[PDB]
Amino acid sequence: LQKVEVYERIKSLLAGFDKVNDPNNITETAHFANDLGLDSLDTVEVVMAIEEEFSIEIPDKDADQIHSVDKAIEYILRQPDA
Amino acid sequence: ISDIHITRTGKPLIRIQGGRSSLGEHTATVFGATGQLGRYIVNRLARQGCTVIVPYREEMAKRHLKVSGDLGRVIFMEFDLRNTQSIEESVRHSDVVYNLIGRDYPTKNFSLADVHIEGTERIVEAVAKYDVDRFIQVSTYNANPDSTCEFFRTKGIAEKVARHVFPETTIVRPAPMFGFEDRLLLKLASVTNLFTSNHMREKFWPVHVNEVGEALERMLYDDSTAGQTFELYGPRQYSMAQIAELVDREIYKKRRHINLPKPILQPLAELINRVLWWDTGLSRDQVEREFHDQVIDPTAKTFKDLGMEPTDISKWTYHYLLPYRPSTYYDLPPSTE
Amino acid sequence: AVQPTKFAVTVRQSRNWADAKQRVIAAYRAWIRAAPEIQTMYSIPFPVSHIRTRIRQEFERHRYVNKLNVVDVLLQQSNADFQETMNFWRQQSHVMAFFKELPSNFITGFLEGRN
Amino acid sequence: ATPAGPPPKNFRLPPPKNWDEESESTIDKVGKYFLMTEMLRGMYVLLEQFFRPPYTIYYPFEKGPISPRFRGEHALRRYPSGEERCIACKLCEAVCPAQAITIEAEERADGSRRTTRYDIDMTKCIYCGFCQESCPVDAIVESPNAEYATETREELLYNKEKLLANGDKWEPELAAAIRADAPYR
Amino acid sequence: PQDGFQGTRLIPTGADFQSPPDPFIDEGARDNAANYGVQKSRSGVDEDSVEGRKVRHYTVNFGPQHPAAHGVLRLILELNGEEIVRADPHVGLLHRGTEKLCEYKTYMQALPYFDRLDYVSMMTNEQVFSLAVEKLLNIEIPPRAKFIRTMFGEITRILNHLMSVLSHAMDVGALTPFLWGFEEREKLMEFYERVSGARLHAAYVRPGGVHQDIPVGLLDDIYQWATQFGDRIDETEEMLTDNRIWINRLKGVGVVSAADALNLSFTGVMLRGSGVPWDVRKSSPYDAYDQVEFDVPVGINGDCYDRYLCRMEEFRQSLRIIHQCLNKMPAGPVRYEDYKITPPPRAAMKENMEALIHHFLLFTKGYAVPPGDTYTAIEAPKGEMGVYVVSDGSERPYRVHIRAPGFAHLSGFDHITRGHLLADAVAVIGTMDLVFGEVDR
Amino acid sequence: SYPTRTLANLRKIGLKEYFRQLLYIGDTKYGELVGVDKFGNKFYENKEELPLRTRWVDYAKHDYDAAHIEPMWHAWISYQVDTPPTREPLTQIERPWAPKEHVPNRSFTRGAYKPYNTTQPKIQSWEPKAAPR
Amino acid sequence: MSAMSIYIIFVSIIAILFLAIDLIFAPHNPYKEKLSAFECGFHSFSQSRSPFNISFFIYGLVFLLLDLEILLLYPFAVSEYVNSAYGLAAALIFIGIITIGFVYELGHDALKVHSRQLKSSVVISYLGNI
Ligand SMILES: NC(=O)C1=CN([C@@H]2O[C@H](COP(=O)(O)OP(=O)(O)OC[C@H]3O[C@@H](n4cnc5c(N)ncnc54)[C@H](OP(=O)(O)O)[C@@H]3O)[C@@H](O)[C@H]2O)C=CC1
Ligand SMILES: *P(=O)(O)OCC(C)(C)[C@H](O)C(=O)NCCC(=O)NCCSC(=O)CCCCCCCCCCCCC
Ligand code: SF4
Ligand code: SF4
Questions:
Q1: How far apart are CA B152 and CA B158, in angstroms?
Q2: Domain B4-324 architecture
Q3: Which residue of D70, D101, D158 sits with most ligand 4 atoms within 8 Å of its CB, as the best mutation to test the pocket?
Q4: Which residues in chain B are contacts of D157 at CB distance < 8 A?
Q5: Which residues does residue D121 pair with via DSSP β-bridges, in sequence order?
Q6: Does C23 contact chain A (CB < 8 Å)?
Q7: Smallest Cα distance from D111 to chain E, Å
Q8: What InterPro entries does the annotation carry (chain B) (predicted)?
Q9: Where along chain B do its domains lie?
Q10: How far is the C-alpha of E428 from the C-alpha of E168, rounded, in Å?
Q11: In whole angstroms, what is the distance from residue F35 CA to residue F45 CA?
Q12: Structural domain spans, chain G
C-alpha cells in the first residue's frame, strides 16, 4: 500500500472518534495516551477501529505495541492486506 | 405515576406498582382487543396488575391475551355488538372503557356505518348508563362527518355521537400503524398485494403501534386527557412508495405492483370483498382511501402532550421484516442505509 | 478425557499484576472484536456501537480493583460468558436480557412511593 | 477392579478360540447366515402375540383399578351431625411439603374453633397424602377422584366452599375408604 | 484470603506435578482406542486455537425436543459428515433446585423430593435417603420393613429396567418389545398403588421403615405375577439377543475399558459391563440383601451389547430375589417402635396423651437428627446412587447432596462416543440409561 | 373382540343394540345389570371377561363424560370395592346437607367454579369525620 | 383420447385439488418464530448451505457405472432366443470384465466407511545382579 494512503484514513477515523481532546493534535508521531488523551480501553478500541478499517487482524502481541500513530503506520505496511 | 390515583367519580386507587402480582387497582374493559392494537394496550394494563375485561367473539383468537396477566386478571366475556346485555355486562365494573372496534371493509352483517356508528352508540350508551369514569374511543386519522370515504366519514360520526352522549371522551386518532403483525409493513413485504389504483404515492405519518399502546396507557393515568382529542402520528411523512422502498431494501426482494385505473379496480375490489370470506385488502372504499392523503388536524393534542417522542419507521424495518429476507441475505446486518 | 469445547480456556491464576493487566486487555479486545459477530448471531436490531458501549461499561465497573484474586474470578466469568456467547448456547432472550434499553431525587422517590 | 486377596478362581478368561476351532458345522453356520434364521424366530414370536388376547380396556366405560389408599382430589369432611370435623389446628398447613394450604381461623359465633379460610392451591399440591396422614380428626382427605380437569387455573384454587362441597358429595366413598384402610393407619 | 490480594505463592496444580514417562519401556503413543484419531483435530490443516476460531464443524442441537433425547437433554453434537467429532451435553434443563429446597423442609418433608430424582426408580431413591437419615438417627428399622424395602427395591429395579432397556430398544428401532414390557410395568404399579396411594410417587419408604403395612392380599398377587414374569423376560429375549441387527448396532459400540470406567466415576452396569465385579448390595449389604442369594451379571467387552446382556440378566435376578422375600417375609411392625421418630398409629394418637403430643410434634417440628454428616450409597437400578446429608442437630437438614449415577455417566459421553456415527450416539444414550431428574436435581 | 365372542354377544343382545354399542363403546359387551346411578347411568358385570373389563358402564347422556358417575359407583367401576352401591350400607346415612341433584364437572360451562377470598380485609381505614370548624 | 394421457391429468388434478383446499380453507398466520428453522427448540448456526462431507460418495461414483452395465444387459434378456450360444458368450465376456472391476472395488475396501470410537510388544528380561 501507500504510506500517505494508510495515514489519511487514520486521521479521519481518529478525528471521528467522539472524545479525543482536540482533533489538531493528531500527527504522524503522536501518542494516544500522552497526546490524544486515550486511556487503556480507548487505545484498544483505536487499534480495533484501525484493524476493521484496513480489513486486517492485529494479533495480541503486536496490538499492545501500537501506542502511537507511527507504530500503527509501520504495522499496516508490514502486514500484507488492504 | 404515583401510588395514588383519583378518578373522575372520585374513588381513590392505592397502588402497588411493579409486576403482574401487584395491584394496579384499575378495572378496564377493552372492546376490539383481539385485533392488532388491542394486545399492546392489554399487555400494558395487565402486566401492571390491572383487571382487564376482554369482550371477544371467536374463542380461539383471544387466547394469546391471557398470558399477559396473572391469575384472575384477564377476564374474557363473550359478547356481540348487537347484544346490548353482553355490552352492559362488560363495562359495568369498570373505571375505563377502551373502544378499539373497527373494520376497514364492509361485511355481510356489518356495514362500515353499522360497526362504527351503532357499535359506538351501544358502547357509549352503556358507558353513560353505568357511569364509567374514562372512555378512550379510538377513531381513525382523517375522520370527518363531512368526508366521502365511508371509513373516514363513519368513524367521524361516531366521534360526535360519543361526545354527545359522554362528553368526557378521550378521542384518539392514530395514523396508519406499523409493528409486528401490522397491515402496513407486512403487506408491502407480501405477494398478494399486487393490485393498486394510485402509484403508491399517497402520504401519511406512520406511527409505531407500540407507541400507541403506550399512549393509551398514559391517557388513563393523565386524567386531564379526558374530554380531549389526540392525533397520534409519526415523526416523518412518507408515501406508500417511500415505505415500499424501505421494505425492499430490508427484505432484499424488490416487490412489484400492478396499477389499475380506479374506475376499473374499484368495481372489482367491491366484488372480491363480496365473494370471498377473508380479509382480501381490497374493497371499494379501501380503494377510495388509497387515493386520499393524511391531514393532521390542528387543535388536537399529540404525542408530545403525553410527553412522548415517536420513533421513525425506518429504525423498525429490520426487526419486523427479517422473517421475510431470503436465506442468502438473512445473515446480513440491518440495512441502516 | 472429554474434549473441552471451542472457546474453553483452562482456569489459571494470574502470575502478577502485569499478567492480569495483559489478560484484561486481551479479554476487552476479544469482546469488542466479536460485537459485529454477536449482532448477526443474535439478530440485534441495535447497531454494534451500542453493544460495544455495554462491553465497555461492564469492564468499567471492575475498574478500581486492586486484588489479584478478585480480578481472576472476574477474568474467569468473562471467559465463560464469552465462550457461552460465541458458541450460541445462550439465545436472543438472554442476550436481550443483557440490554436494559431508581428515583433521581428524594422528592421524586417520595411522591411515587419508594421509587 | 477385582477384590483384594486371592484373585477369583478362573477369573482369567480362557484363550480365544480360532476360526477353525469354533465347533459349528459350515452347513449350519452358512444356513443361519443366508436363511436369516434367528430373525424368522422373532417374526414367529410376533405371530403368536397376534393370537393372544389384548390388554386394552375401553376408558371411560371401563376403568383401571385403584385402591382405598388412592390419593385424588381433596375434600373436607363432616361428622354424622353435619358439624365440620376441621378444628383449625393447622397441622396440615405445617406439614405440607409444597405450601399449598393456607388456613385462617377464629372463634365462631358460638365460640367454636373453626376455620374462616381454607384454601388448597391444587397447582402447588404434590398429592403425597401427608396432610390426611396428620389430621387428628380425619377432616382433610384425598378422594378417589382423578377426573377433575379444568379449563382455567382459577378453577384449581379451592376455597373452603369448594372443599366442603367435595366432601358433601363424596362422603360415601371417603367413609368406605377410611373404613377399609383405617386399621393400617 | 488476604494474601490473595497481592501476588503470592501460586497454588499447586496438576500440570505442575506432571511426570515424564520412562523411555526404556514406553511402547506406543496411544494405549487407548478412544483417542486413536477419532476426535477433533484429526482433519483440516491448523488447530482451532488460532486461525481456526473462525470456522465450525457441522453442529446440531440433539434435543431437548427429541425422542432419543428421552426428555430434556441438549446434546450439542459436532458432526464431520455423519461422524461425531465432539459431543457437548448441556444439562440443567430440569434443574429445579431440589438440594436447596430440601434445606427449608423437615426430614419428612424432603422425602417426596427423592421420589422425583430418578423418577422411574422412586422407592429405591426413597431408600437411599431413608438409610442416610436412619444412620444419622442411630436407629435399627424392624425386620419386616427391611424385607418390604428389599422386595419393593427389586420391584423398582424391574420397573426401571423395563423403562430403560425397552426405551433403549425403541431408540434403535425395535417398537414391539416396548409395548409388551409396559403391560408388565403397568401390572407392577398396581403393587405401588396398593401399598401407597400413588402409581408413581409413592412416598412409601421413609426413615424408620415404611409408611403403612402391605394390604392382606398383596403377597399372593405378587407371587401370581412372579409365576409368569419369566415368560415375559424370555419373549423380549427372543427378539433382541440373537437378532443380527440388534448385535451389529450394539456390539463394539460405546466401549469403555475397566480401568477407564472406574476413572470416569462409572457405576452399575456401566462399570460391570467392563468386567469389574462390583455391586453395592454385595459389597456394603443394606436392608435384607445379605439375607438373599442373587448373582451379579458382569460383561467382558464393555460395550452396549454386554451392558444389554447384563441388564436382561438382572431381570431374572430381581425376580429371583423377589421370590425369596415373599418366602422370608416376617411378622412384626413396619415402623421403628419409637414415636419420637415415627408417627404413632392413628388409634393410639386418638386414645393416648403421649401418642397425641408425639403425633403433633412429628408433623409440625419434625424429629431432630443428631448432628453430623454421612455419605450413604445404594445399588440403584442406574448405578451407585448416593446422598451426602449434613445434620445440624435440628429438625431441618443443613445440606442434602444427591450423588446421581447418570450425572457421572453423561459426563463420560464424549469420551466413549467421539468417532462413532449419529445413530451410535442414540445407542449410547439408551445404554447409559439417563433420567434427567437425577442428572439435574 | 373375536368371532366366537362377537357372534355369541350379538346373538344375546340383538342387532339394534349391537350397532348402538358400536357407536359408544365400540365393543360388543353382554352382562347383567347391577344398578343405576342417580344420573341414569347403567352398570353391568361379567366375570367371564378379560381382566379389568368385567365391569363397565353404559353412560346415560349421549355426550358421555367420565365425571357423570355417582361417587359410590365410581369406586365400584374402579374395582376399589366389590359390593355395589345397591348393597352398600354407607349409602344409607341420611345427610340433609348432601347434594340432592347430580353435581358433575362444571368446567367449560358458565357453571364453572369461581374461587374467592372467604375472609375479610385485614386492615380497616378510618372513615373520615371532618368536625365543624 | 388414451388412458395414459387422462391418467396423467387426473393424478395432477388430485395433486392440485388437495393442494388448493389447504391453500384456501386452512388458517394462515405466519410469524417470525413460527417461520424459523427447527433445531429442537434452540436456534443454531445456519450452515446447511455450506460444503458438507459425504462419506459415501465413492459409492455414488461406482453406482453411476454399474447402472450403465446392467442397462447394457437388458437387451440380451429380451433377445436370448436369437442371441443363443454365440450371443451368450459375448454377454458373459462383457459381464466377466465388469465383474473384475467390481472385485477391484471389494478388494481395495472402496465400499467401506471407517468408523469406531494392537497389543503390547515390549518384553523385559531379568539378568539379576551384575
Ligand atoms: N391499524 C391501523 O393502521 C389503523 C387503525 N385504526 C383503528 O384502530 C383500531 C385498532 O386497529 P387494529 O387493532 O389494527 O384493527 P383490527 O382490524 O386488527 O382490529 C379491530 C377489532 O375490532 C373488532 N371488530 C371489528 N368488527 C367488529 C364487529 N362487527 N363486532 C365486534 N367486534 C368487531 C375485531 O374483533 P375480531 O377480531 O373478533 O373480528 C378486532 O378486535 C380500529 O378501530 C382501527 O380502525 C385507525 C387508523 C389506522
Ligand atoms: P489502563 O491502565 O487504564 O487499563 C485499564 C484496566 C481496565 C486494565 C484497569 O486499569 C485495571 O487494571 N483494572 C482492574 C481490572 C478490571 O478492570 N477488571 C477485571 C477484568 S474482568 C471484567 O471486567 C469483566 C467484565 C464483564 C464481562 C466482560 C464484558 C462483556 C459482557 C458481555 C457483553 C455482551 C454480551 C451479550
Ligand atoms: S389438620 Fe385437619 S383438622 Fe387440623 S386444621 Fe388442618 S384440616 Fe383442620
Ligand atoms: S397431599 Fe397435597 S395438600 Fe396434602 S400435604 Fe401433600 S401437597 Fe399438601
A1: 10
A2: 3-Layer(aba) Sandwich (3.40)
A3: D101
A4: 71
A5: D157
A6: no
A7: 23
A8: ComplexI_NDUFA9_subunit (IPR051207), Epimerase_deHydtase (IPR001509), NAD(P)-bd_dom_sf (IPR036291)
A9: 4-324
A10: 9
A11: 10
A12: 3-108
